[PDB]
Design a protein around this ligand. Structure first.
Ligand SMILES: [Zn+2]
Ligand SMILES: [Zn+2]
Ligand SMILES: [Zn+2]
Ligand SMILES: [Zn+2]
Ligand SMILES: [Zn+2]
Ligand SMILES: [Zn+2]
Lengths: 120, 121, 121, 121, 121, 120
C-alpha cells in the first residue's frame, strides 16, 4: 500500500545563534523544549501489518537523542550555528544512514514555529 | 476557482491488540488508545458558498465509520484483525473513498507522539 | 543550498458570520473563533546564516495584517464579506505574497479539529 | 464513599464585546473566541456504580445552556450584557446549580492562555 | 522552607469496560483510552537542592504501578474490577501512598475533556 | 463575586542546576520552554465586570517575563539555583508587591511536570 509513519521526540536543550546583531534575542544564551518528528515512507508489510516497528525507530534515534537532550547544542561538532534549519539537517544526516526510509525531519523550536527537511 | 485542502479531526476511544508481534511484546497485550484520525480533502472553492464543502458534511459522511470504531474493540471489526496504525489508515480509506470522492489523505494517531498518513497510493 | 520549509503560527480572536449558508445553519448566526494561522515559507538555506529568512522579519511583515483580523469582526474587512476559512486563506495570501516572496502556504484553523490550507493554486 | 471532584469540559464558538471598557480598548470591539468551559462536581463515590455521576448526565443537563452559548452573540443573552469571563462564570453557575446540586466549580477560558474560576463564593 | 506543590504527569494506553452500566451503554463495551495520570506531592523546599523532591524520583516511585496499568486490560487488575476514573483514582492512591508519603492528589483523565481528582481518606 | 483569574506566558530559557550530584542530567547546560501561570483572586467589580483588567496584569508582569525569556536563568540575581520551586518563589517576590491580588504562581519546566506556589 505505501504510507508515511511518524514518531515524535522532545529534547530539552540550550543554544544561541553566533551571527545575529548585538541586540538580538536569538544571540543570547537560551533554550527550548525542542520537538523532533521522524517520518519514514515505505510499503506496508502484508504479514506484520506495518512499515517498521515504532520501537525500532526509538532505538535507532536514542544515541542521537542523548547527544541533544539536556545539552548545549553549540558544543556538538557541526552545530556552532544551531538554527532550526541546521538542526534539521544535522538530525537528518545522523539518522539517514541508520534509517534508509527516512523521508522527513521536522523540528519545532517553540509551540508556534517549525522547520522541515526532506534531504532536498 | 482556487484549489485548497481541508481537514477535519475525530477522536475515538478504542481497544486493540496486535496478533503477530512476539510473545512478550506490549502491543500484543489487550490495550487501548484515544485514536485521532484526520480526514483531508482537496477541491476548488465555490465563488458563492465560498467553500469546498461544509466541514459538517465531512463529519456527517464519516459518522457511520466512526461509530463502528469508537468505544469498540478494533479486532472484532471485519478487515481489522491486525489493527495496526497502517492497517487502520487503509481500512478507513477503503470505507471512505466511495462516499467522499475528493478524499486526499487519512491520518491516524495511535498516541500523541506517533501517527500514520495514507494517500491511497 | 538545501531546500527547507519553515512555519510561524499566529492566533487571532475574531467574530464572523456566513452570509450564504442555508436558513437555519449555525454559521449564519453571529459567532466567533480563536482562529490559528500558520505562515509557511520555502527556500534555500543560506550556509552562513543557517536560515532561509529571519522569522522576526516575517513576524514584522505580517503584523498590520494580523492587527486587521485580531479582536475584530471579519465581515467588516474588505474582501472578507464571506469569511470562510477558504476565503481567509486566500485573503491572507493576497495581502502577504507581494511582501513575502518565499511564502509557500497559508493554513487557517477556525476550530481545534478543523483546517484549511492554501498554496496559491 | 470516597470524596472526589469530577469535571467535564465543553467548547463553544461565540462572539462578544465589552460595553464598559475605555474608548479604544480592544475588548470593546466585536470579536469572539472558542470558549472552553469546565463543569466540576463534587460528591461521594457510589459503591454500586463506582462513580459520583455519569459524565453523560452532566452533559445531558448542560446541553440547554451550552446551546444558548454556542454559535451566538453573548451580549444578546439576558444577564450577559457585560460578558466578561467573570460574569460568564457567574451566569453559568446561576443557570446550572439549580439543575446539578453537586456543582462545585465553573471554569471559563476565553483563550488558551487565560482562565476564570468560580466556586459559588 | 517555602511550602509548595509539585506534579508529574504520565500517560498509559489501556483497555477497560464498565461491568455495571445498563445493557446498551457504550462504557460497558470493551474499549480503551490514553489515560493521563497526574501525581501531586506537597512539602518544603530544601535550601540547598532548591526542590521538594526531584521529579525523576516521583517517576521512579510510580514506575511499578504505571507498568501494571500501561498496555494492559484494567479489569484484569485486582482492585479495579470496576475501572472507572473514580475507582482508578482511589486505586492509584492506595498503591502510591505507602511509597510516597507526601502524596497529596491523584488526578486521572480518561479523555482530553474529562477528569477525576482524589485526595485520600 | 469572589473569583480567581490566571494568565499564562511561555519563556524560552537556558538553565543548569548547580547542586545536583555529579552525574545528573540537570547539572549540564540545557534549557526549556517554561510556562508560567499567574493567578489572582478578588471580588468582581459590578461595573467593569472584572477583578482586574488582564491588560494591566500583562503590563506589570511583562518586564519580569522579559528577564526570563531568551536568557540564561543562572545570571538573574536570586536565580543561582534555578529550579522550578525557586522560579516560583523568585516570581512571587518580584510581583507580589506590585500585584497584591496575586494568589498563585505556577511554572511548568516541561509539558509533564509543574510546580505551584501560593506564598506559604
Ligand atoms: Zn532559539
Ligand atoms: Zn497500540
Ligand atoms: Zn464559524
Ligand atoms: Zn474577549
Ligand atoms: Zn471509558
Ligand atoms: Zn531543567
Amino acid at each position: 500500500s505505501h504510507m508515511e509513519l511518524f514518531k515524535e521526540f522532545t529534547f530539552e536543550s540550550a543554544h544561541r545563534l553566533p551571527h545575529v546583531p548585538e541586540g538580538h534575542k536569538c544571540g543570547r544564551l537560551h533554550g527550548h523544549s525542542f520537538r523532533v518528528a521522524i517520518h519514514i515512507e515505505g510499503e506496508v508489510d502484508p504479514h506484520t501489518g506495518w512499515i517498521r516497528d515504532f520501537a525500532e525507530i526509538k532505538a535507532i534515534f536514542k544515541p542521537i537523542y542523548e547527544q541533544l537532550d539536556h545539552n548545549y547544542l553549540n558544543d556538538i561538532p557541526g552545530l556552532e550555528n544551531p538554527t532550526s534549519e541546521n538542526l534539521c539537517r544535522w538530525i537528518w544526516q545522523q539518522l539517514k544512514p541508520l534509517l534508509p526510509e527516512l523521508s522527513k525531519v521536522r523540528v519545532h523550536e517553540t509551540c508556534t514555529s517549525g522547520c522541515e527537511y526532506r534531504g532536498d
